[PDB]
Design a binder for this molecule. Sequence first.
Ligand code: N47
Ligand code: N47
Ligand code: SAM
Ligand code: SAM
Ligand code: ZN
Ligand code: ZN
Ligand code: ZN
Ligand code: ZN
Ligand code: ZN
Ligand code: ZN
Ligand code: ZN
Ligand code: ZN
Lengths: 272, 271
Amino acid sequence: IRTEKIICRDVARGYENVPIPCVNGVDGEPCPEDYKYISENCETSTMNIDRNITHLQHCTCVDDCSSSNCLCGQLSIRCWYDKDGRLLQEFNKIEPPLIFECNQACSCWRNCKNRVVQSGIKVRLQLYRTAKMGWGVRALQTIPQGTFICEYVGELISDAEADVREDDSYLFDLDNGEVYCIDARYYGNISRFINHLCDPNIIPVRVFMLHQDLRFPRIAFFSSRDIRTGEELGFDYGDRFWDIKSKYFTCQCGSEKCKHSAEAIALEQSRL
Amino acid sequence: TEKIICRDVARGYENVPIPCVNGVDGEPCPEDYKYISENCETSTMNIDRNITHLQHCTCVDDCSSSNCLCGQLSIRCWYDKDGRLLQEFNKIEPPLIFECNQACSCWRNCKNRVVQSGIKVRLQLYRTAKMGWGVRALQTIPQGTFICEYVGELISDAEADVREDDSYLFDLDNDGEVYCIDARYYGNISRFINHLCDPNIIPVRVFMLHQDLRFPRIAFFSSRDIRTGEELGFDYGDRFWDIKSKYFTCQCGSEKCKHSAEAIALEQSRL
Ligand SMILES: CNc1cc(C)nc(Nc2ccc(OC)c(OCCCN3CCCC3)c2)n1
Ligand SMILES: CNc1cc(C)nc(Nc2ccc(OC)c(OCCCN3CCCC3)c2)n1
Ligand SMILES: C[S@@+](CC[C@H](N)C(=O)[O-])C[C@H]1O[C@@H](n2cnc3c(N)ncnc32)[C@H](O)[C@@H]1O
Ligand SMILES: C[S@@+](CC[C@H](N)C(=O)[O-])C[C@H]1O[C@@H](n2cnc3c(N)ncnc32)[C@H](O)[C@@H]1O
Ligand SMILES: [Zn+2]
Ligand SMILES: [Zn+2]
Ligand SMILES: [Zn+2]
Ligand SMILES: [Zn+2]
Ligand SMILES: [Zn+2]
Ligand SMILES: [Zn+2]
Ligand SMILES: [Zn+2]
Ligand SMILES: [Zn+2]
């Protein structure tokens, strides 16, 4: 009875390396427009990010930064990107290390091997209307394990500002006393529409590029396994989110392994 | 003879490569500076990057209409449909340009985004006969075309005041309390552009991703048609020549030259 309609040829309005279309084959919900699409983190009130170019640790490489003498690699133990820009198979997917990409202070060229996240989105993604979870994001192509997908982009806000945001649905915690969040509620990119999955296929990794202010890592999603075409993308939102939200709604991810469904929570409340 | 001694002085940081040739002498490709493609800071400048402070448009076309708010913040959008300054653009007294930004409703490829889109023309760093390194066009360039930005280290008046080398400074005209770009230590292709008494490019103040009026970004546009091989240059202005004249004199070689040893002698000797 109902057709899949294409309702936006590019929700990023041309701001990404590729267009991100939106389709809806499920209901009458038109293209989401209660937010401003931005491709890189914004600020409302000042974050006082340390941008002093002299504070950048940087490499003195004269090659494409594949030697273990690259200081940038060394700051993360080693450079973790293979030759096609994908995380090495031994990459710690459980506790990813901080990645330091090469920056404007490095001697190397813009096209060295240590610049994956800064080069932006390469895989083809689609915003689509899911059965039970509002909008979601899926792959239009297969994506090998360890490939960079997109960054979690938003408005940088302080601990205190987060405390009083009305909607807490789109917060990402920036990990390291004085702490900050990304809030994608009013300003965000394609990643604000990525759903929680109890069986995730992407992991967030903290990355530094043009600054190395440790209060403000940038959050890069990489696939944690090969992803088949058409699969929904999803990461583990984590307990902070679910401890709060569990009483308003439960997880609809549909996995055998789901630990946040109405069923999982009732089995748990009773196993206690 | 004239050999290519760097394939790209910008190390792939620009949209296009900028080669270095030397057919005049034995000087190697300059390297006493760090090539950057965007302005940098050393000491903190606190640029206002509050997205809510951005004046922005509500267009859902390509921003060609006179109703584009961003266009009006400079009387009119000054760019034709090919991204060139209008013929009637005030080349003597250029107004402030406000390009579209991340707060505008429009698309990234609207018509009000010329400078933020980067270098498009083919430029070359070459060795000149008499003024060290210079920059020249490797193609014809019509009047009103964006060439490159003057990129460097943002610094205060006080800091400029104590800089040993004052050869690479650009004043950011502003209200109260003023800043400079110093391209001495950190710079892009434009640090190599020489002064000409018969100039073929002009600097324009432009705002893009922020609108902190202390820190306009400086875009060079051609002020007439330029032929392949022509040296680019602008008028450095009296402030530079006043300081510099007692050290060296203008070698631009134009009959209009007003800063040569000769021209300076004829004025001292009208006194
Ligand atoms: C309240 N004051 C604060 C203050 C600080 C520093 N952090 C937080 N974090 C936080 C609060 C509520 C959350 O959930 C309702 C939450 O979820 C993070 C994981 C789920 N996100 C959803 C999309 C991006 C990832 C984080 N809240
Ligand atoms: C000393 N304290 C200052 C302080 C401030 C606010 N401005 C300046 N400006 C300045 C000083 C010396 C200069 O020249 C010797 C000069 O040249 C302006 C134009 C020449 N530039 C050369 C490359 C780009 C254009 C500007 N100096
Ligand atoms: C970051 S937004 C994800 C995009 C969201 N689907 C939308 O339509 O905007 C997070 C919100 O999506 C919904 N959501 C995400 N993952 C879910 C899940 N596994 N089960 C149920 N609802 C989920 C909840 O409304 C949650 O607060
Ligand atoms: C911003 S740099 C331009 C690049 C410089 N030619 C170089 O080789 O690095 C300015 C300096 O270039 C030289 N210069 C530029 N225009 C000149 C001119 N018209 N006559 C003589 N020297 C000039 C002077 O040394 C001046 O202080
Ligand atoms: Zn390196
Ligand atoms: Zn590198
Ligand atoms: Zn490096
Ligand atoms: Zn689940
Ligand atoms: Zn507009
Ligand atoms: Zn605009
Ligand atoms: Zn526009
Ligand atoms: Zn002259």
